[PDB]
Amino acid sequence: ADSDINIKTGTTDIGSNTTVKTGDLVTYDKENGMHKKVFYSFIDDKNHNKKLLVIRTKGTIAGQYRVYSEEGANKSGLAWPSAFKVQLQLPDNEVAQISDYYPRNSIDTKEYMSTLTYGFNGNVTGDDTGKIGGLIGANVSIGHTLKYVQPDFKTILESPTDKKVGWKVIFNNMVNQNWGPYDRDSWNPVYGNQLFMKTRNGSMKAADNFLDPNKASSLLSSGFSPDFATVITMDRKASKQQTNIDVIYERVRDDYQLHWTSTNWKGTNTKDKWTDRSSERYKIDWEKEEMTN
């Protein structure tokens, strides 16, 4: 908070009384199904120390959630997006540097609750024959309650070096038709990994027995559209005013197969089965304030 140090709010920010030349570059990768897009903005504040360039890799990455193989009614497979990644890199010989990046790791909290209860009890029982009975009792109880919120997909900022910074979205866990949350490492001795399972002991075809993509999370089938911001700073006295960047939009898929053993369906998951990578190289012209490729 700028106002908590008694400084007038917005005083220390950069971008005042200057013209920024924005831009946009859109490209679609038919082979990998990644509608990648970057939104740049050249800021050169005289009161600042270095030339600035903020790059927002908005884009969109498809989900690719479908049944790839079926072998009769006995067994079938499924490929689902385990993780989405997008990273920017600079050549080792380059002079520009990575300064900031908005989406960053944040500390997560949890509730906690301790309970203690004392009790007392006493009743008098009687019947027709005149018998009279008594009872005196007491009890204690101690309880611990802990609650927290866990998303389906968890965004992470991989350790950013000076030249490359990258983000990552992984599959935390999912709830299958109101059943408890399942994850890639979940296992059951009878049924196995019941993550994308429709019915435990249905009589349908193996390929038919899979969770409806509408029922599952949206990111599995319709994909994940990132919104990540990074700023590159270049010294204004550098000999060479041209820079190259690489943008990658890799996606990792897993193999989920269920098998009809004797009576019930048994599901098995094989993590990190395929990876689809789409890298494109852009060129920066600091003198002309335009990035084109």
131, two tokens: 């018998």
Q: Return the one option of ligand PC, a second copy, none that residue 285 interacts with (CB less than 5 to 8 A, by type).
A: none
Of 70-78, 108-116, 238-246, 249-257: span binding a second copy (CB under 8 A): 108-116
Give the DSSP letter of residue 187.
-
Residue from 19, 93, 106, 114 touching ligand PC (CB under 6 A): that is 114
160, two tokens: 């950013």
- Is residue 251 within 8 Å of 244, Cβ to Cβ? no
- 131 scored as a contact of a second copy (CB under 8 A): yes
Residue from 143, 237, 239, 262 touching a second copy (CB under 8 A): that is 143
Which string of x and - marks every residue 209-248 that binds a second copy (by CB under 8 A)? ---x-x--xxx--xxxx---x-x-x---------------
- 189 scored as a contact of a second copy (CB under 8 A): no
- 22 scored as a contact of a second copy (CB under 8 A): yes
Give the nearer residue to a second copy in terms of CB position, either 67 or 229.
Answer: 229
Distances (CA, A) of 12 to 17, 94, 121, 190, 235: 14, 29, 68, 62, 20
> Within 13 Å of residue 108, how many CA atoms lie on the same side as its CB?
10
Give the nearer residue to ligand PC in terms of CB position, either 131 or 144.
Answer: 144
Give the nearer residue to ligand PC in terms of CB position, either 19 or 178.
Answer: 178
- 149 scored as a contact of a second copy (CB under 8 A): yes
Give the nearer residue to a second copy in terms of CB position, either 140 or 262.
Answer: 140
- Is residue 218 within 8 Å of 60, Cβ to Cβ? no
232, two tokens: 């590159």
φ and ψ at residue 218, rounded to 5 degrees = -70, -35
Give the nearer residue to a second copy in terms of CB position, either 4 or 239.
Answer: 4
Give the nearer residue to ligand PC in terms of CB position, either 10 or 181.
Answer: 181
267, two tokens: 């599901």
Which residue is it, tokens 């900022």?
A: 157
**Where in 127-166 is the site for ligand PC (CB under 6 A)?**
144-146
Residue from 6, 47, 106, 115 touching ligand PC (CB under 6 A): that is 115
Give dist(CA 86, CA 247) in Å, integer: 7
Give the DSSP letter of residue 48.
S
